Amino acid sequence: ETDRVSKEFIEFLKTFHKTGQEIYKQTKLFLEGMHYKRDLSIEEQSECAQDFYHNVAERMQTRGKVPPERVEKIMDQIEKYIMTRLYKYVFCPETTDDEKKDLAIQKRIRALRWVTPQMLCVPVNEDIPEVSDMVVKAITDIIEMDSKRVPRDKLACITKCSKHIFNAIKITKNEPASADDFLPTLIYIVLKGNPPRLQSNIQYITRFCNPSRLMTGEDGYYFTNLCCAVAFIEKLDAQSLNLSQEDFDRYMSG
């Protein structure tokens, strides 16, 4: 696969022949350097990648007189390339509590399989085949996030998931979904899906995705909601589900 990305990257840079070859050298040198920084904290490595993005984006416009309109495409090609290559080294580092967190969240979600959409006031009626299918399609995308290496592709999965969510809500209510309808539905989808390495995926995106795509409202709104969904689940309690500590503890055990 990576060879496919390398070919696509090299072929893509010839398109800009002049500046292209230059960017390729800079990119190859950045990776060579990251090899020597493998032992640093994931935060610092994230900083090297974030700086690399910034510095290369400001080196074309100037030295290459490249149109600020074509830059975006290029940057996406660069992220695809380097992240496709760093993935094995920066995703869920043994040097972080990423794995311990993936496990706690997984165990946590697995212990909450008794939580119903009703308890969460979720505007989703799975007794309606169409809605049920929307729900499973949503889960599919959230789960497939883990199989993607590039942060942008991981984001695309989150977006595809949320779009199935809105249709599930639309069909159930027979009208457009309200603002307050989303988050509860996403929490439900995550509870029923228990997405692989949820915490590692969230951190990876936050660490190596071009920040320009995370708080711009586009995929940023969806990403923020998923983080908010995980946090909601982490601290979910009796009152949270609209119950008395009594009931809650009953379910949680028996």
Of the candidates 102, 103, 104, the residue with the CA atom closest to the CA atom of residue 203: 102
Per-residue binding string, Mg ion, 183-222, x by CB under 5 A, is: ----------------------------------------
Residue 248 near residue 241 (C-beta atoms within 8 A): yes
Cβ distance to Mg ion smaller for residue 141 or 219 = 141
The dihedral formed by the CA atoms of 195, 198, 204 and 205, expressed in degrees to the nearest 10? 70
The token pair at 70 is 């074509």
What is the per-residue burial (b if ≥16 Cβ within 10 Å, else e) of 180-189? ebbbbbbbbb
Residue 74 near residue 136 (C-beta atoms within 8 A): no
In the complex, what is the shortest distance from the CB of residue 72 to Mg ion, in angstroms, rounded to a whole number? 25
Site for Mg ion in 123-162 (CB under 5 A): 137, 141, 160
Cβ distance to Mg ion smaller for residue 166 or 251 = 166
In the complex, what is the shortest distance from the CB of residue 141 to Mg ion, in angstroms, rounded to a whole number? 5
Site for Mg ion in 71-90 (CB under 5 A): none
State CA 9 to chain mean position distance: 23
Size of the site for Mg ion (CB under 5 A): 3
Cβ distance to Mg ion smaller for residue 141 or 181 = 141
Cβ distance to Mg ion smaller for residue 22 or 133 = 133
- Could you report how far apart the first and last alpha carbons of the chain are, in Å? 47
Q: What whole-number distance in Å separates Cα of residue 191 and Cα of residue 160?
A: 17
In the complex, what is the shortest distance from the CB of residue 87 to Mg ion, in angstroms, rounded to a whole number? 23
Cβ distance to Mg ion smaller for residue 160 or 207 = 160
In the complex, what is the shortest distance from the CB of residue 138 to Mg ion, in angstroms, rounded to a whole number? 8
Contacts of 198 (CB under 8 A, 6+ apart): 102, 105, 106, 190, 230
In the complex, what is the shortest distance from the CB of residue 221 to Mg ion, in angstroms, rounded to a whole number? 19
In the complex, what is the shortest distance from the CB of residue 62 to Mg ion, in angstroms, rounded to a whole number? 41
| One-letter amino acid of 159 | T
Cβ distance to Mg ion smaller for residue 108 or 137 = 137
**Could you list the residues that contact Mg ion (CB under 5 A)?**
137, 141, 160
